[PDB]
Design an enzyme around this catalytic site. Structure first.
Site, PDB file in Angstrom:
ATOM      1  N   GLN A 130       0.825  -1.203   0.000  1.00 41.37           N
ATOM      2  CA  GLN A 130       0.000   0.000   0.000  1.00 41.37           C
ATOM      3  C   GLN A 130       0.861   1.256   0.000  1.00 41.37           C
ATOM      4  OE1 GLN A 130      -2.771   0.203   3.251  1.00 41.37           O
ATOM      5  NE2 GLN A 130      -3.933   1.894   2.344  1.00 41.37           N
ATOM      6  N   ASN A 153       9.734   7.138   8.729  1.00 35.12           N
ATOM      7  CA  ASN A 153       8.631   8.093   8.663  1.00 35.12           C
ATOM      8  C   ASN A 153       8.697   9.180   9.733  1.00 35.12           C
ATOM      9  OD1 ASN A 153       7.630   6.646   6.513  1.00 35.12           O
ATOM     10  ND2 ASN A 153       6.122   5.517   7.731  1.00 35.12           N
ATOM     11  N   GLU A 193      27.053   5.284 -11.965  1.00 41.89           N
ATOM     12  CA  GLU A 193      27.943   6.044 -11.092  1.00 41.89           C
ATOM     13  C   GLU A 193      27.305   6.356  -9.746  1.00 41.89           C
ATOM     14  OE1 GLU A 193      29.142   9.442 -13.291  1.00 41.89           O
ATOM     15  OE2 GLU A 193      30.494   8.326 -14.614  1.00 41.89           O
ATOM     16  N   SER A 210       6.919  -1.193   1.581  1.00 42.44           N
ATOM     17  CA  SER A 210       6.955  -0.977   3.019  1.00 42.44           C
ATOM     18  C   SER A 210       7.414  -2.252   3.712  1.00 42.44           C
ATOM     19  CB  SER A 210       5.583  -0.557   3.536  1.00 42.44           C
ATOM     20  OG  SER A 210       5.608  -0.391   4.942  1.00 42.44           O
TER      21      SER A 210
HETATM   22  N1  LIG Z   1       5.346   7.166   5.012  1.00 41.03           N
HETATM   23  C1  LIG Z   1       4.357   6.403   4.560  1.00 41.03           C
HETATM   24  N2  LIG Z   1       4.253   5.094   4.984  1.00 41.03           N
HETATM   25  C2  LIG Z   1       3.248   4.309   4.529  1.00 41.03           C
HETATM   26  C3  LIG Z   1       2.318   4.815   3.635  1.00 41.03           C
HETATM   27  N3  LIG Z   1       1.437   3.833   3.350  1.00 41.03           N
HETATM   28  C4  LIG Z   1       1.792   2.726   4.036  1.00 41.03           C
HETATM   29  N4  LIG Z   1       2.904   3.007   4.782  1.00 41.03           N
HETATM   30  C5  LIG Z   1       3.628   2.074   5.661  1.00 41.03           C
HETATM   31  O1  LIG Z   1       3.060   0.782   5.579  1.00 41.03           O
HETATM   32  C6  LIG Z   1       3.067   0.164   6.847  1.00 41.03           C
HETATM   33  C7  LIG Z   1       1.907  -0.815   6.978  1.00 41.03           C
HETATM   34  O2  LIG Z   1       1.726  -1.554   5.788  1.00 41.03           O
HETATM   35  P1  LIG Z   1       0.616  -1.082   4.724  1.00 41.03           P
HETATM   36  O3  LIG Z   1       1.209  -0.098   3.748  1.00 41.03           O
HETATM   37  O4  LIG Z   1      -0.571  -0.495   5.448  1.00 41.03           O
HETATM   38  O5  LIG Z   1       0.180  -2.397   3.914  1.00 41.03           O
HETATM   39  P2  LIG Z   1       1.292  -3.336   3.241  1.00 41.03           P
HETATM   40  O6  LIG Z   1       2.661  -2.715   3.360  1.00 41.03           O
HETATM   41  O7  LIG Z   1       0.925  -3.569   1.799  1.00 41.03           O
HETATM   42  O8  LIG Z   1       1.197  -4.704   4.077  1.00 41.03           O
HETATM   43  P3  LIG Z   1      -0.244  -5.237   4.547  1.00 41.03           P
HETATM   44  O9  LIG Z   1      -0.686  -4.414   5.731  1.00 41.03           O
HETATM   45  O10 LIG Z   1      -0.140  -6.688   4.943  1.00 41.03           O
HETATM   46  O11 LIG Z   1      -1.235  -5.075   3.424  1.00 41.03           O
HETATM   47  C8  LIG Z   1       2.977   1.298   7.850  1.00 41.03           C
HETATM   48  O12 LIG Z   1       3.788   1.027   8.968  1.00 41.03           O
HETATM   49  C9  LIG Z   1       3.500   2.511   7.110  1.00 41.03           C
HETATM   50  O13 LIG Z   1       4.763   2.874   7.613  1.00 41.03           O
HETATM   51  C10 LIG Z   1       2.418   6.128   3.206  1.00 41.03           C
HETATM   52  O14 LIG Z   1       1.596   6.578   2.414  1.00 41.03           O
HETATM   53  N5  LIG Z   1       3.441   6.923   3.672  1.00 41.03           N
HETATM   54 MG   LIG Z   2      -2.524  -3.917   2.362  1.00 46.70          MG
END
Ligand SMILES: Nc1nc2c(ncn2[C@@H]2O[C@H](COP(=O)(O)OP(=O)(O)OP(=O)(O)O)[C@@H](O)[C@H]2O)c(=O)[nH]1
Ligand SMILES: [Mg+2]
Ligand SMILES: Nc1nc2c(ncn2[C@@H]2O[C@H](COP(=O)(O)OP(=O)(O)OP(=O)(O)O)[C@@H](O)[C@H]2O)c(=O)[nH]1
Ligand SMILES: Nc1nc2c(ncn2[C@@H]2O[C@H](COP(=O)(O)OP(=O)(O)O)[C@@H](O)[C@H]2O)c(=O)[nH]1
Ligand SMILES: [Mg+2]
Lengths: 436, 430, 61, 71, 439
Positions: free
Chosen positions: E11, E206, E254, E140
């Protein structure tokens, strides 16, 4: 001065012949009446499929055979009723009802004589006859029986004339009937020693192609027939349209079948894209030739990655250029996931034709300025024979349904020789596939 | 006056002839109707070399077109200048060969040969003083590779003193279009080595390479390839049709080019060639002409001369030039590259001059060189042939009409013997 | 309408290969004969001696 | 069979057009129309897209209408 | 004829992809529908867009990226988004069931049913390009599906290609700020996987970007959109030299030729300047000297790390705008003169500078101001061991009583994988320790 004669037997054969003859007629600009397109206005190409009646209309060089009258009644009642000759749509009285023995020994022999009379009456007209095309659903009794009978009769009546069989084998897991293994095996035993070139037309692969590419989630037999007709046209355009590098029907058995026992090929067509995104990609020769070799695009449910390649014949029609074709061939050769057999250094035959592919009104494909049709002989096609063999022996272990064929004039043993012939074919394939 | 007749067969041969006759007709100023509209005396004194005279003041080429299928000639008749050719000359079969050398050399060509032999005999007997015959054909296609060689054998049996040329298109393994190339190529070479007085090899890979790198044009085509090859044909026989400082006939070139009877396979080259964008820069001088002419990439054969040693070379210049610079430049290029010239044949370059340039040019050069670098073509062809033949693949088509594996083995052995003998002189020293 | 117009009456009464010959072969003037090429010339008491030797190769027929 | 076209777009040239070319200075393989050709065909090719789009949508309407009646 | 291939998974990956692709869209002037309004560009010829987009012959340009997910909400949002006509209809691969923050589910149960589709789409995209520079991946680490699919794709690509460069922009959980409760487990597993399969890794936690947007942009309620915009700006500054003319161009090759002294230690941290809001931008001077000074404070860093606790190995700077080479060299001289920043002894020269002429662009509805100078920072320093140590402590605390491991062993993944991950990470801190020691 070159002609080819079409033979359509079985319900599937009729339903694909109608589709292909719509396409040929649209290509040559004939109206359903059989004349020139009205009075709004002659390159002499229609002679490849049609013959001039002496006054106006054109009669196709095709014959339809069936034992159940139905489809013949609808084709005689439809809009093309005046197009076909009234006495080439041969209709029987009782169908074989999925029984190969009925159609090979009991009732088809009374109709095969009229069929041969009509075939002679069509052949004597032609002077530079290239050969015969035959269409038949193999998983049906009357279709298989008449297809066999016609094959062995023609093999002795004509001899060296070439014949091409475009058969539709049952899918690995999807099937309509319950007795088709028996008649499919018997028909294969028949056609192995009698058909010069055979092409796979399994329905599962076409269903998958339609689902993935055309985005049609409720497709019927008409779309499959349209795709098969497109394959037919891409194959036979070379005889009736000018091209930079031409290939005749005789230039297949000399290039695609390394040994006489090995004459089963599988096909692919490209591009196959729905019009909603069709031209939002450039449809270049490189990407279409990659999609052609893509294993997900096979016309039959077989994976070539499980085996080697012996021959590949590709026909490009449209705006292709030889330099681009050769550049694509180089990339295909360099690609590692596709490997050729050792004793074949170069395995590509290439043909070029300038006539672009057409669109049929009410169709699904988009009319594109470039297209490619591929037919390959590769070792991977042993898997379908193996699975049909297992299905057949599962049936024959307890001698189930055998009475329905024993009581129809054919004795007990014929299953044994068919099974042995399949075993010998597998022996030959896996002996050829081994490196020296 | 020591004239030649043209023989062309196959789709490839017909397509080459269609452009070669166009080039010669335009050089001699003849319309497609057959009426002269030229401007100079020199265009007509030696017009009988290539053209016969008919009633009404018109000229007709003395060419014979053959094939096993009618489409190719019924197509060339539709091309520009297609009206020149005489309908009596066209000979065609109603079946075709299907790329089967056995079919085109044993079954169908055997019965077709009668009419074309009759017409070639009539044409040869009609002309007063023969010079020789030239053939243009492709070795990869069954009809050409079989019918042309059979006709070569038949006509050599009848005219042993006449000179014979073959312009052979050898199938490359890179740009491969059919899967049966090695078989018919080897069987063609086996018959060619025994009978052809001169053989001159052209490769489509080399044509594509030169067109892509020297011309730098976006979209090449078989028309462009035929253009280059037609210029090559015109270059060798220009001085036979026009006067010059030093006349040199085909017999003269043959005498000065082949040290041994079995070594008559040549690679050729045409100069100058320049791109549209670079045509305005370069200055046409003798040094530029010779440096481009001895360039490795300018060669119309994929073989690389620098991998071998030149047995001999010949150069034909066109235009008004003085012999001093020609001789000095050829001496200089022979001196500066002593490693690539075999040493026991001193002064192994021939030069000839014609004072009539190609229309639109002042100076042109046609080069024919006998070198041992051609052995790699035959080595790769034999390698592919043996790889595909050990498994007896694609064989029953040839064996089903009176052919046996003994002929195949004999052809392979003869070709390998030719390769070994041709490389023997490479390491010969005095 | 390419060969549908054929009929027996028109077919047989139509010469096809032995009608008038093509041009450029008509080119002889019928009355002009021998004894008339030269004996009907005119003849003249004093001949003209002007003879031209053009520096062009003579055409051979 | 036939080869009446040297390349697919351009036909053979008139005899008047081939005035020289005895020497290899003009080849007609330099094209000089490549970008224009591509730009021209691609636009009409988009047009085939949008035309097929109307057909698709029209048959889509025609395939809802009957079930709307059946309800 | 130089191209890169972009991978978005998770996500967070999808949300970063949205911002980076809208930024590239606006930069190259292509329209959201995909049809260019047409123009004669302002830099590096008209082939510039080829670096990120591909010509269909005429009309819409297909981005060279692939989107992967198993929960269809974000993919459906993108498909119904304003760029519905831009992206290729079937390169946005979406599954049916989420991994639910469990690494085992995404790495052993439901990853294979989608990895083959991803590989095929990668094949089709890679066959298009000719001079493929490399791959970029966004994911992530604290999420189950993102972590598992990223690990699987890296492992599979390492054998599909090998020598082609891959860069990974990873986002670790913050030292105290986190959303899930089991993210240390899958973070440790993911690093244990990607240590052996990633050429260059960039740390993008973050909490640091939260602090940055709080202190600089004067925004008291930011959202992930701002963070994605900052990440997109970083990517654009990194990749601008590949398509825009400059005095000193720097290719992707590079970076792994100036930033990673040994293959083991390839984790770097990236900074950016200037990062200022418009209202207070009316005051400062925006000179190269002060922006490059601002790039060096740990408070400006987008990774929650303190470089004052360790030595610097390598530095890469990407200037863009109207920078002058002499000014850049003077800035480097002043920095080297400064004492509070110390380099490692065996690296006498440790700066790789590149110059690009195109000034950065500003997205409408954004928060940054239009500036004529910018500098991007990618540094490798010894201070990075502290985050690894902190995750070591947290994972030890949670694993002391074997909590939550019943699930991780329940989807087929064995019990022992945690121990080897611990050993690998421990070797990593140890290595980073003897790297920084003086001879
Ligand atoms: N900085 C930032 N972090 C994000 C963002 N979207 C998701 N994250 C990170 O993603 C982590 C949680 O995972 P998700 O993105 O919600 O979903 P996923 O990585 O696909 O894994 P699942 O939850 O199993 O679906 C959080 O701890 C966030 O740090 C974003 O738009 N900005
Ligand atoms: Mg997800
Ligand atoms: N591809 C394709 N296959 C078809 C079509 N129609 C029928 N078949 C195949 O034909 C098989 C049964 O044979 P039919 O064609 O229905 O009838 P038949 O071939 O005349 O044999 P009988 O049923 O005994 O009369 C089915 O299992 C189908 O697989 C068609 O329209 N397209
Ligand atoms: N130079 C040249 N080569 C050609 C032409 N047409 C075909 N070829 C080459 O000839 C090979 C096939 O020749 P083919 O048509 O079988 O010759 P044929 O059997 O005598 O008609 C191909 O590999 C082509 O590369 C042409 O017009 N010019
Ligand atoms: Mg039926």
């Amino acid at each position: 001065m070159r002609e080819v004669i079409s033979i359509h037997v079985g319900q599937g054969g009729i339903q694909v012949g109608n589709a292909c003859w719509e396409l040929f007629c649209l290509e040559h600009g004939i109206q359903p009446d059989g004349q020139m397109p009205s009075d709004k206005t002659g390159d002499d190409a229609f002679n490849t499929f049609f013959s001039e009646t002496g006054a106006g209309k054109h009669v196709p060089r095709a014959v339809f055979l069936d034992l159940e009258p139905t489809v013949i009644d609808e084709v005689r009642t439809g809009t093309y009723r005046q197009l076909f000759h009234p006495e080439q749509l041969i209709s029987g009285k009782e169908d074989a009802a999925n029984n190969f023995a009925r159609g090979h020994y009991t009732i088809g022999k009374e109709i095969v004589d009229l069929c041969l009379d009509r075939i002679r009456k069509l052949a004597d007209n032609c002077t530079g006859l290239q050969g015969f095309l035959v269409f038949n659903s193999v998983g049906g009794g009357t279709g298989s029986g008449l297809g066999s009978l016609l094959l062995e009769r023609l093999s002795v009546d004509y001899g060296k004339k070439s014949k091409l069989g475009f058969t539709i084998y049952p899918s690995p897991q999807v099937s309509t009937a319950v007795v088709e293994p028996y008649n499919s095996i018997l028909s294969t035993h028949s056609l192995l020693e009698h058909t010069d070139v055979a092409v796979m037309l399994d329905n599962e692969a076409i269903y998958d192609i339609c689902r993935r590419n055309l985005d049609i989630e409720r497709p019927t037999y008409t779309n499959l027939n349209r795709l098969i007709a497109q394959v037919i046209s891409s194959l036979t355009a070379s005889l009736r349209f000018d091209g930079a590098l031409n290939v005749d029907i005789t230039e297949f058995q000399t290039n695609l079948v390394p040994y006489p026992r090995i004459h089963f090929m599988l096909s692919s067509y490209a591009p196959i894209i729905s019009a909603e995104k069709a031209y939002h990609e450039q449809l270049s020769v490189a990407e279409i030739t990659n999609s052609a070799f893509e294993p997900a695009n096979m016309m039959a449910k077989c994976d070539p990655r499980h085996g080697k390649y012996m021959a590949c014949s590709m026909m490009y029609r449209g705006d292709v250029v030889p330099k681009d074709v050769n550049a694509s061939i180089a990339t295909i050769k360099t690609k590692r996931t596709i490997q050729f057999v050792d004793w074949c250094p170069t395995g590509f035959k290439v043909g070029i034709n300038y006539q672009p592919p057409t669109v049929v009104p009410g169709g699904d494909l988009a009319k594109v300025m470039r297209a490619v049709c591929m037919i390959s002989n590769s070792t991977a096609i042993a898997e379908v024979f193996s699975r049909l063999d297992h299905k057949f022996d599962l049936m024959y272990a307890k001698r189930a349904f055998v009475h329905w064929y024993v009581g129809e004039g054919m004795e007990e043993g014929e299953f044994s020789e068919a099974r042995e012939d399949l075993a010998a074919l597998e022996k030959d394939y896996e002996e050829v596939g081994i490196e020296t | 006056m020591r004239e030649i007749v043209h023989i062309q067969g196959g789709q490839c041969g017909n397509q080459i002839g269609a452009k070669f006759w166009e080039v010669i007709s335009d050089e001699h100023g003849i319309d497609p109707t057959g009426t002269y509209h030229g401007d100079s005396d020199l265009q007509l004194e030696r017009i009988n070399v290539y053209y016969n005279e008919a009633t009404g003041g018109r000229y007709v080429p003395r060419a014979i077109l053959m094939d096993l299928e009618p489409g190719t000639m019924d197509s060339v008749r539709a091309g520009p200048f297609g009206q020149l050719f005489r309908p009596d000359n066209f000979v065609f079969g109603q079946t075709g060969a299907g790329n089967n050398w056995a079919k085109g050399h044993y079954t169908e060509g055997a019965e077709l040969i009668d009419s074309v032999l009759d017409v070639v005999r009539k044409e040869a007997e009609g002309c007063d003083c023969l010079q020789g015959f030239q053939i243009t054909h492709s070795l990869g296609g069954g009809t050409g590779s079989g019918m042309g060689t059979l006709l070569i054998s038949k006509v050599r049996e009848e005219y042993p003193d006449r000179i014979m040329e073959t312009f052979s298109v050898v199938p490359s393994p890179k740009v491969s279009d059919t899967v049966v190339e090695p078989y018919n190529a080897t069987l063609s070479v086996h018959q060619l080595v025994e009978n052809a007085d001169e053989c001159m090899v052209i490769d489509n890979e080399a044509l594509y390479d030169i067109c892509f790198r020297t011309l730098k044009l976006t979209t090449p085509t078989y028309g462009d390839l035929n253009h280059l090859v037609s210029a090559a044909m015109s270059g060798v026989t220009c001085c036979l049709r026009f006067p010059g400082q030093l006349n040199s006939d085909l017999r003269k070139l043959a005498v000065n080019l082949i040290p041994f009877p079995r070594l008559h396979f040549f690679m050729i080259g045409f100069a100058p060639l320049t791109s549209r964008g670079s045509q305005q820069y370069r200055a046409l001088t003798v040094p530029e002409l010779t440096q481009q002419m001895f360039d490795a990439k300018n060669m119309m054969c994929a073989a690389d001369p620098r991998h071998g040693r030149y047995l001999t070379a010949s150069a034909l210049f066109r235009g008004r030039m003085s012999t001093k610079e020609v001789d000095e430049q050829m001496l200089n290029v022979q001196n500066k590259n002593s490693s690539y010239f075999v040493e026991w044949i001193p002064n192994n370059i021939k030069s000839s001059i014609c004072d009539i340039p190609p229309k639109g040019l002042k100076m042109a050069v046609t080069f024919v060189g006998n070198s041992t670098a051609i052995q790699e073509m035959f080595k790769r062809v034999a390698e592919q042939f043996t790889a595909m033949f050990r498994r007896k693949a694609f064989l029953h088509w040839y064996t089903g009409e009176g052919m046996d594996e003994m002929e195949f083995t004999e052809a392979e052995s003869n070709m390998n013997d030719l390769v070994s003998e041709y490389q023997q002189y490479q390491d010969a020293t005095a | 309408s390419k060969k549908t117009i054929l009929s027996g009456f028109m077919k047989n009464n139509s010469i096809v290969g032995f009608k008038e010959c093509l041009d450029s072969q008509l080119q002889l003037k019928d009355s002009k004969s021998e004894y008339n090429d030269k004996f009907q010339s005119k003849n003249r008491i004093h001949r003209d001696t002007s003879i031209f030797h053009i520096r062009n190769k003579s055409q051979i027929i | 069979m036939k080869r009446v076209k040297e390349s697919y777009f351009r036909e053979h040239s008139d005899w008047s057009d081939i005035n020289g070319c005895s020497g290899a200075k003009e080849f007609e393989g330099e094209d000089l129309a490549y970008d224009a050709r591509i730009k021209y065909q691609k636009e009409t090719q988009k047009q085939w897209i949008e035309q097929q789009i109307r057909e698709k949508k029209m048959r889509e309407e025609a395939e809802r209408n009957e079930e709307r009646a059946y309800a």
